[PDB]
Amino acid sequence: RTGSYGDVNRVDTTGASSKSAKPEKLNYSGVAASRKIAERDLQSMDRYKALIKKVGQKLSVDPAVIAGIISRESHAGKALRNGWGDNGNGFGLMQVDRRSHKPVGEWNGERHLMQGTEILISMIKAIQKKFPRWTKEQQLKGGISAYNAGPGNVRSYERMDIGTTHDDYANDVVARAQYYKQHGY
Secondary structure, eight states: OOBSSOOGGGSOOOOBOHHHHGGGTOSOOBHHHHHHHHHHTHHHHHTTHHHHHHHHHHHTBOHHHHHHHHHHHHTTTTTOBTTEETTTTEETTTTEETTTSOOOSOTTSHHHHHHHHHHHHHHHHHHHHHOTTSOHHHHHHHHHHHHHHOGGGOOOSTTTTTTSGGGOHHHHHHHHHHHHTTTTO
């Protein structure tokens, strides 16, 4: 499923920076690093695969992108403490910020995934409004970056991820997504 927000396969990526790769005990960075990390989360992700696809169907969002976010946010849950991460602010597989949203649902359930994905949509639409001369695919990458840092942070295409966690968030997520898209998402 491509979704209504652009084709993730058409988005360029430089993958995970050293800052993301090191914590995962990898001695290389880049797209292969993103792919490896995603692969490591594949079995756990696959626990949720039919829900992710329901959610992608309902919202016209690529389930691969949802997966890529989950991997990055929570390692498909493996990084959480009883549902929580981000210094106690983030909830669930997609790590919805409780400070600005009212988290709904079980940490690993459909309502949660719907919530996170609606929020993603809202970021993408923000970027579409902010940068109407970008392509849909450009806007998609920006949206994903904004999922981490807010649309305010996106002031460029090529350097959007400056100011995201590890200064690589959308690049990493896009690579993860492109991986999952090849693994049944």
